[PDB]
Amino acid sequence: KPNYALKFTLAGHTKAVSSVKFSPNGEWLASSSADKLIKIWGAYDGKFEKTISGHKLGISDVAWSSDSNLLVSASDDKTLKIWDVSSGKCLKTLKGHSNYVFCCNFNPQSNLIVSGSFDESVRIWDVKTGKCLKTLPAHSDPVSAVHFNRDGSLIVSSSYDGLCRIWDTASGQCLKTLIDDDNPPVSFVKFSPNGKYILAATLDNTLKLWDYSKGKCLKTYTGHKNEKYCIFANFSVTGGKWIVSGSEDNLVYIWNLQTKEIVQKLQGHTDVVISTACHPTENIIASAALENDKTIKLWKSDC
Ligand SMILES: O=S(=O)(Nc1cn(C2CCCC2)cn1)c1cc(Br)cc(Cl)c1O
């Protein structure tokens, strides 16, 4: 079992936090918020670095380029913005979605951005030009998450319509649709580190690890509370093999990947833990909570 202990508590956002992400080089934490801001913090001691502003409405998600030099944000103002982190400047505004943009990610090459929206589409954008390359009629309800696999050749998307879909990046074709009988809304999905599985959260207090080639559920992780909010889940790859998620009972849950047992619950937050992120090289977790709690917390474990 890990022994995550609280090291720093960070404050500054003035409305609900929506997303926290560590930069791939491990140097920074980015947070996004309904207060329309992105904030950058030192990954190791939480030292505030800068505020990045320009969206006209709140932000649901942020994501880093592989060289840690760019951010992309997804906003209720129906746009994504590409940011130069060092300058704070908006390089491009990605226009095309017809409603709130809920989720975004760079591909590993970071020449493309994928986005998902309340407008039920997935869009693929050229980073250099800001042009939308493809619009995929991906789902029949808001798109809750979009993620590239480790070589960039596939996209996975999830939706409140109950589906997870696998897309060929280059062609835009749907290669696979994952289905559940009770059809609970899918609130989050991402590829596993080795690219063979997808981890999917559903709004019935359940995380599932799917082999999407076989269309088979291999693991289920339960015990937490998740019936309302889009709460990310993470693979922890630096020490023991853990699954990490926030929860609507104000705790961070950590599970053993293979046995599905809860190995730790992190207490401290005073509201829903809306987002967590795992550091790329150290056993460090960042957690963020909703507008009653107002903090981001940094935790460290020996394994
Ligand atoms: O999910 S994984 O991509 N690979 C994987 C799967 N399993 C078992 C076998 C099938 C079900 C779970 C073991 N390793 C992965 C997860 C974590 Br946390 C860390 C790393 Cl390093 C990693 O590679």
Swiss-Prot record:
Changing F102L: Strongly reduced affinity for histone H3. WD repeats lie at residues 12-51, 54-95, 97-137, 138-177, 181-222, 225-265, 268-302. Coiled coil: none annotated. GO terms for molecular function: histone binding; histone H3K4 methyltransferase activity; histone H3K4me1 reader activity; histone H3Q5ser reader activity. Changing A16E: Strongly reduced affinity for histone H3. It comes from the Eukaryota. This is WD repeat-containing protein 5.
